[PDB]
Amino acid sequence: EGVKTDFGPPYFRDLLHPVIAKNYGKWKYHEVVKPGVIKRVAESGDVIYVVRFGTPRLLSIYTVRELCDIADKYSDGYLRWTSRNNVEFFVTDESKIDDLINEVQERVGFPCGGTWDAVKGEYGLSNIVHTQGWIHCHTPAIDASGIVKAVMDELYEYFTDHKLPAMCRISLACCANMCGAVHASDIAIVGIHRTPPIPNDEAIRKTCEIPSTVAACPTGALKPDMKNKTIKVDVEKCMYCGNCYTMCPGMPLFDPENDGAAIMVGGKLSEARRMPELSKVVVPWVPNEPPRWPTLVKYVKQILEAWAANANKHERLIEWVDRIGWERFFELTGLEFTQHLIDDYRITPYFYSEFRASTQFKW
Amino acid sequence: EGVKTDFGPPYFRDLLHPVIAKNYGKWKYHEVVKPGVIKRVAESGDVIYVVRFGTPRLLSIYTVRELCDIADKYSDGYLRWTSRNNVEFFVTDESKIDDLINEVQERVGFPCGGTWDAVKGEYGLSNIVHTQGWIHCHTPAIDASGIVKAVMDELYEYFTDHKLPAMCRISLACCANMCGAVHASDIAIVGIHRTPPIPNDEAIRKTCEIPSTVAACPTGALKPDMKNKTIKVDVEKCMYCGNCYTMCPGMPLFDPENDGAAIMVGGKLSEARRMPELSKVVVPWVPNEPPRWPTLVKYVKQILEAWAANANKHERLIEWVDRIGWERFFELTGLEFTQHLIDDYRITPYFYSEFRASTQFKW
Amino acid sequence: SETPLLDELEKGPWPSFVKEIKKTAELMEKAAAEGKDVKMPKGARGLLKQLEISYKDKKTHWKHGGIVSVVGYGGGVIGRYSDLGEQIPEVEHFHTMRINQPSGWFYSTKALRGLCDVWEKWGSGLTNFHGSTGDIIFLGTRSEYLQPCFEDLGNLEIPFDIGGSGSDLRTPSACMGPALCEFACYDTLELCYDLTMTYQDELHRPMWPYKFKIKCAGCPNDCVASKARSDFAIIGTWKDDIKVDQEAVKEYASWMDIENEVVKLCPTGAIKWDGKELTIDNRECVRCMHCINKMPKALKPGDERGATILIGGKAPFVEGAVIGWVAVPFVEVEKPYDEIKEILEAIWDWWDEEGKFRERIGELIWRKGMREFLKVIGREADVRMVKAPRNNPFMFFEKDELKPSAYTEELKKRGMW
Amino acid sequence: SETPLLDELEKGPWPSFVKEIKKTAELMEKAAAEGKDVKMPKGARGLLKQLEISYKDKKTHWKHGGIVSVVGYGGGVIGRYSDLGEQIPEVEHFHTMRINQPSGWFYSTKALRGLCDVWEKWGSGLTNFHGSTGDIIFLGTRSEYLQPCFEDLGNLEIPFDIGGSGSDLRTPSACMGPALCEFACYDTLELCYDLTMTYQDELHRPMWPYKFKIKCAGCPNDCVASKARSDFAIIGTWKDDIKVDQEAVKEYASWMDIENEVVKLCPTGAIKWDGKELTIDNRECVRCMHCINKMPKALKPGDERGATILIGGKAPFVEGAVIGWVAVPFVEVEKPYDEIKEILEAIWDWWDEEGKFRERIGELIWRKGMREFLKVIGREADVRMVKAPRNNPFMFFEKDELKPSAYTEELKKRGMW
Ligand code: SRM
Ligand code: SRM
Ligand code: SRM
Ligand code: SRM
Ligand code: SF4
Ligand code: SF4
Ligand code: SF4
Ligand code: SF4
Ligand code: SF4
Ligand code: SF4
Ligand code: SF4
Ligand code: SF4
Numbered sequence A, B: 001e002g003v004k005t006d007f008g009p010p011y012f013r014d015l016l017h018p019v020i021a022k023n024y025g026k027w028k029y030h031e032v033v034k035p036g037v038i039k040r041v042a043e044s045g046d047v048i049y050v051v052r053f054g055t056p057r058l059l060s061i062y063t064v065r066e067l068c069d070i071a072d073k074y075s076d077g078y079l080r081w082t083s084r085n086n087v088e089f090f091v092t093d094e095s096k097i098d099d100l101i102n103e104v105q106e107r108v109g110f111p112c113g114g115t116w117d118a119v120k121g122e123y124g125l126s127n128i129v130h131t132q133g134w135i136h137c138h139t140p141a142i143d144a145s146g147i148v149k150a151v152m153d154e155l156y157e158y159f160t161d162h163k164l165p166a167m168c169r170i171s172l173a174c175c176a177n178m179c180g181a182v183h184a185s186d187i188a189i190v191g192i193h194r195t196p197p198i199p200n201d202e203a204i205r206k207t208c209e210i211p212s213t214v215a216a217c218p219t220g221a222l223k224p225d226m227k228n229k230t231i232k233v234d235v236e237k238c239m240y241c242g243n244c245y246t247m248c249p250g251m252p253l254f255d256p257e258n259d260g261a262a263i264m265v266g267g268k269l270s271e272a273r274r275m276p277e278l279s280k281v282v283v284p285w286v287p288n289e290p291p292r293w294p295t296l297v298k299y300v301k302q303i304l305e306a307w308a309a310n311a312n313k314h315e316r317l318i319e320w321v322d323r324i325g326w327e328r329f330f331e332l333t334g335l336e337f338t339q340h341l342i343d344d345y346r347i348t349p350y351f352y353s354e355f356r357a358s359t360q361f362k363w
Numbered sequence C, D: 001s002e003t004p005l006l007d008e009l010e011k012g013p014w015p016s017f018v019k020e021i022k023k024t025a026e027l028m029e030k031a032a033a034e035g036k037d038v039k040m041p042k043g044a045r046g047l048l049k050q051l052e053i054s055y056k057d058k059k060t061h062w063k064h065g066g067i068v069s070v071v072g073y074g075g076g077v078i079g080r081y082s083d084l085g086e087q088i089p090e091v092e093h094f095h096t097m098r099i100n101q102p103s104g105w106f107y108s109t110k111a112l113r114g115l116c117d118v119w120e121k122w123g124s125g126l127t128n129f130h131g132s133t134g135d136i137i138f139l140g141t142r143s144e145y146l147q148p149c150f151e152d153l154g155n156l157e158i159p160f161d162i163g164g165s166g167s168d169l170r171t172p173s174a175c176m177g178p179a180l181c182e183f184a185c186y187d188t189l190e191l192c193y194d195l196t197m198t199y200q201d202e203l204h205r206p207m208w209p210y211k212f213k214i215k216c217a218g219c220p221n222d223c224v225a226s227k228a229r230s231d232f233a234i235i236g237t238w239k240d241d242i243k244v245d246q247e248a249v250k251e252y253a254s255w256m257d258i259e260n261e262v263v264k265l266c267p268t269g270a271i272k273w274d275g276k277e278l279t280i281d282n283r284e285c286v287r288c289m290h291c292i293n294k295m296p297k298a299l300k301p302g303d304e305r306g307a308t309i310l311i312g313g314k315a316p317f318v319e320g321a322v323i324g325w326v327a328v329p330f331v332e333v334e335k336p337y338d339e340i341k342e343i344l345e346a347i348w349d350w351w352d353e354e355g356k357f358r359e360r361i362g363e364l365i366w367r368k369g370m371r372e373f374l375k376v377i378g379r380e381a382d383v384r385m386v387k388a389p390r391n392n393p394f395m396f397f398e399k400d401e402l403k404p405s406a407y408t409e410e411l412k413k414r415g416m417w
């Protein structure tokens, strides 16, 4: 007896819809019926329908109850989530699709959409990759679920209709730890501090490991005192990364009035047409404005829209910019260049720019 | 009186040809008549022909006297050098061009040529910019003058006619200080060492300032040896760059069996068509083998010709590589790719790659 | 009202997390009234209030969590304490539990229902579906309910193990792959489970100088963001001809501008459309996928399949954010995946020896050089590894590459060899 | 032969440097045996002897020289001493004198004959035309002869001063520019001469952290390699439209494939040609020069002329090679060039103050940052300074951009802000 361990997650193969199990690894072609429903013929011609739905990621167990009950109807009791946190469903009867849509709409209240098709070339907004934020995180400069809800309020109409010329992902990290693909997305929200730490010297003297704290700082901004036994900080050197707060309890840098979000732009992870790209900062700072965060959400469309309008079919944001240049962009999206946006992050090496950060090469 | 100082150079305007002085900044067009002969027509209708000649750059004052006797007779007392060390005479009477050309080859033995014509897209190879080598310098890995002679013998055909589809600059540095624009040249030859220095403590103690010697090492492979008032070198870290020997004569690292030349490609200075680019090493090392350097010459020759044979009009080496990629480059050139060619020089900032190293931008 | 700011976000068309929280509030509190076995029916209101202060306060109300483990494991539990501890007693210890999701995030209802069973009984009722790394998140329970919950989890008809955290192997993730994609060059879902089982000890009991993340993508679309998120991203690919069917490709040309939308959009100009034939020169193709994305029916990934391994993918700290770079151009993806494992094992042997405390694999490669990295994995250098040869002559040479000379003997003589 | 390895390089079409050394040897030896005042009849013969040995040993026989120079200057004269002084006394000292070239290397014969007279008398009789920066190299003389060489230099009919060397302003150089070239955007030769004259003091008398170089090109073709081989590249440009002559464009069209060789090659797609009219979208033009290069009878740089300043270029040591980057997108270039000089002087004051021993301007800017760089030259950040904005959010902010808060207040009172 005595508590079993190391048994791993369940075997996936057991928990696949029966049509999906039989036709595993043997499919002909995919097809997007409308906003939200993707059809998929087998090789035999077994027809399955993946029907996508946005979730607020965080969920009550009673929201998990309801979906299951919805699933036990339309999808033989089977379902999955997606990489961008969307719930999926497997209807085998095509005349039973539209019904399902409402059932979800009424009960837990999830929309239908989150898809996009390269074929016709009509892309649309998927969900935003985010995380715990003020709900459960001790190092956020911003809140995720909140800054999400707002963005998908103003850009709702986008999730449930294929109106964008090319794939756009928006994403959010709540501090510069940058959990998730915030470093490589089409439009990114990043929590940043703006204030140096006022060290709790009486909290360091007991809790922390100083040499491992001091060395953790990217710019050598941290040096120890031997007396004393308390870290000093050169303000001429801290760019407020908040990493030493991740290390050491009493290195706090929360300014409620100055912590906020930067807007990155230009990221990309896929290979199609052009090689992947790390996002680029375009708006240096916008404030936390609970609960509706109007500055941020406005700038997200003072950015998405200016691209949306001007872009060709398939041309994502960084692909737009290589065509027009960073000159035009900044004028077109109504933005300001400041010296804040000349990269000055000294430690990263030139030699990485010469490595193949891509699967794109010839045999 | 008292010795005259601080009068600088003779004012160029006193030393120009009269036709040049009058049409100063008043030109209609240039036109490449034939290899080494450029017709320049002023708005005044004055025609002048600038006639170009290869030189060994190292000149005998008795040669310069020969050039002067020649300038008096064909060019009214005037001549110029070029930024690639070719020499140029001015002729007004076009029934005289060929006499000059023939008198110059005769008397001093310098070939007319070094020109190119973007209009027709037919290019010649010009002089090799090089430095002092064993003639004068105390820090060289290779000889400048011998490599330049042995290379030019072989490519002579290309200095006298327009046999190339695009510009190709060959440049040579006797060591890694470069003393020229080798680092931005279609084909660069760069001497290197492959052996770390042996500290001669006694010469170090006598002649070397330690802290500045130490801070001159880009890898941090030098440390001060306090109790022996000298310098300790960590070999695992040394890449034989030589800098510390420039700094301190106690630190020499010459090895006649192991010093040789890198071959680099794909540098570009002009903006025409494509941005400027630094050269990229494609052959790690070849021996010195005076007086002819056959191995090194064989590879310069094999690189040029692969490019020339497969290049489109205007397409310089880096613009060739831009089209075909490096995989096909190494194949076509028949070079080998090894781990030496993976950049590992760590001190250079990523952020320099984000900077606009060029004059190309929209207004 | 009690939660003025948080209630305004209960408005709108996107589904609210607040009516997810409030549903968790009033229905967990119903169970307690109804006489159901629920240890923290308090966890979810206290979570709403604390967040209310944080909205007005515009800053967090969680302080550093102290190491709280589940017996046997060190990895699996992210402990979190609350600074408004006495203001809201129910959230003194609101620790997350990362539970290993089945690869591809596929579930039967039973699986989810039994999972809803335990977290109701032993937690706050709040979940994440799904976490960024891929784990099902159980958001907030006390330190005394960690071990009983994991016991019930190992006692469900459909059992779920704890996932990863700390300086360990995290929970590997995989795109839907062969299950629902026809682009998949290999069975992402099976190699996910396998690796997840093979290194259970590596996942549960942190032994490394830092974290290590693997993800698996079935074709260069990178649908689980693996080259931005995982240190070691398996990104499926092929080596031979992209299979074309000229029937469907005709059909397409009835309505789809292939010239402006395919031919001209290919990054190397490999693909051409004639009006009748589609020629692919696979020699100049880069497997960008765009041409199979544009014609799903008529174009498939080549017969000879495998993967490209990208190393170093990681977020910013310390020395800058990374998109994984080419480590092994092609490795074959074959049960039991011994070649894939040999690489990882070799890497961790090397990374456990040479890594500084808190040093991601990518930074150490930068620190140590690719020659040493390739040495470890036993791979030669390949031009494909780089976007261009180095732009400086500052090369290291190995002892045994030099011509023997008076100078080298001098080096040997002083023991500087 | 006395010199059999060098004899080999008397062979082959290309003019021989060995022939130049030998020629000097013979005729310096003839002049001096036939009555002439020649101080070093054997200079050239010693150097070729030493150069033969260097070829045989495959290594230099020069060594770290000593400091040396003319009375009044602390630069322009490089001491070099031979490690074979014993065997070959005539090369025991063999210093170089760097003599300041005329703008764009333009000579009359009388000017050249003066130098030859002066060098024959006091030195080896060997030269470089030209040193890489631009200077005439007097190659080989003893310490005793330096000042008397200079006195004669100063006294000739057309006199030549010493160039630069060391941690000074070096000898600036220019492309031919308006003396011959119809693409020129400013007067390269005039500027260069005037900067040389304005800063004789900074040039003759090393004062700075390390060396500084200015080079002037009349348009972006940049035919003096300024962005690679000067710290301050002044590269001419324009703001308005490219002037186009259509009669002229048509005459190209009868024979030149403009579509392929011009239209397709434009980096920015800004130039159309339909069969009867050429159309440059000047808003999309980058001034790369290709279209004008191709069509010089038909297209000229536009009327609003000036220069882009490019900052920092250098060979590798210590922190890597640089092609200078956009510092000032456009500055007017007009006599007396007060605008350029104010940027130079501000930089020099800054660099003199903040630079490390043997740190280059480009490197200093990499260490202190561009905002400080820009504040120094009193100019504003501009998107044209970057090829891309930052790939990380770790930005510094000014104390004045910062919002008033309890925090800001609490750190003023801590001695930190
Ligand atoms: C649902 C999901 C599978 C999963 O959960 O395992 C998915 C599914 C498909 N992706 Fe994807 N992709 C999924 C993550 C992604 C994301 C990854 C991410 O955001 O984390 C992108 C890469 C993001 C990036 O590049 O920044 C992605 C890269 C692609 C590419 C896009 C290339 C492009 O730049 O346009 C193709 C697009 C296409 O088919 O036209 C693609 C195509 C597809 C196809 C069409 C392939 C097929 O034949 O089935 C799948 C149908 C979805 C659709 O709406 O067209 N999928 N795909 C993904 C989860 C996200 C979601 O819920 O929407
Ligand atoms: C004479 C000289 C200036 C001087 O004061 O010494 C010069 C003069 C001209 N250059 Fe240059 N360039 C001269 C060195 C350069 C160099 C600088 C160097 O090599 O160190 C390059 C920059 C190198 C690089 O880009 O790597 C240079 C890049 C150009 C460009 C670039 C062509 C391209 O395809 O990128 C133009 C365009 C052209 O080809 O007509 C150009 C064109 C010209 C034109 C045609 C312009 C004109 O209206 O007359 C001039 C005649 C050149 C010809 O042969 O047709 N010149 N030009 C240069 C002496 C070189 C020699 O003796 O061989
Ligand atoms: C004379 C000249 C070579 C030639 O034969 O033409 C020269 C020769 C020497 N150079 Fe240079 N450099 C010459 C132009 C250059 C140039 C390019 C230019 O000026 O156009 C550069 C690259 C741009 C730059 O300076 O950054 C150049 C970059 C260097 C480097 C340092 C660059 C760096 O990485 O920071 C070394 C080492 C140093 O200065 O510390 C150096 C140092 C030297 C030393 C003093 C050797 C040493 O290691 O201490 C040279 C002595 C030769 C001798 O005693 O006879 N030389 N050197 C060149 C100038 C003559 C003239 O005035 O016209
Ligand atoms: C659990 C999760 C949020 C969520 O619930 O969605 C998370 C949350 C935390 N992350 Fe993370 N990270 C989460 C995925 C990531 C990812 C993405 C991934 O792994 O797929 C990254 C970037 C990818 C990577 O690093 O390879 C990420 C990069 C970080 C950073 C930066 C790491 C670095 O290289 O510098 C810190 C690192 C640290 O622990 O110091 C961090 C550390 C943390 C800590 C332990 C906070 C801290 O600094 O002490 C987090 C505790 C949770 C909390 O608030 O109580 N987290 N973090 C994410 C995992 C979900 C899941 O398991 O399903
Ligand atoms: S990005 Fe920052 S605030 Fe968000 S979950 Fe990660 S550590 Fe917490
Ligand atoms: S905020 Fe960042 S840069 Fe400043 S002391 Fe902390 S770790 Fe260093
Ligand atoms: S490149 Fe090197 S060897 Fe050549 S002259 Fe310059 S410093 Fe001396
Ligand atoms: S030779 Fe170069 S890398 Fe080696 S110790 Fe000297 S400066 Fe350092
Ligand atoms: S990564 Fe490729 S195989 Fe996997 S889900 Fe995306 S498109 Fe399909
Ligand atoms: S996969 Fe991409 S690169 Fe290859 S042929 Fe198709 S479009 Fe071209
Ligand atoms: S830089 Fe321009 S102006 Fe000067 S020579 Fe070259 S083409 Fe003529
Ligand atoms: S100058 Fe260059 S970018 Fe401008 S029109 Fe001519 S070719 Fe095009």
Ligand SMILES: [S]
Pocket: none
């Ligand atoms: S120099």
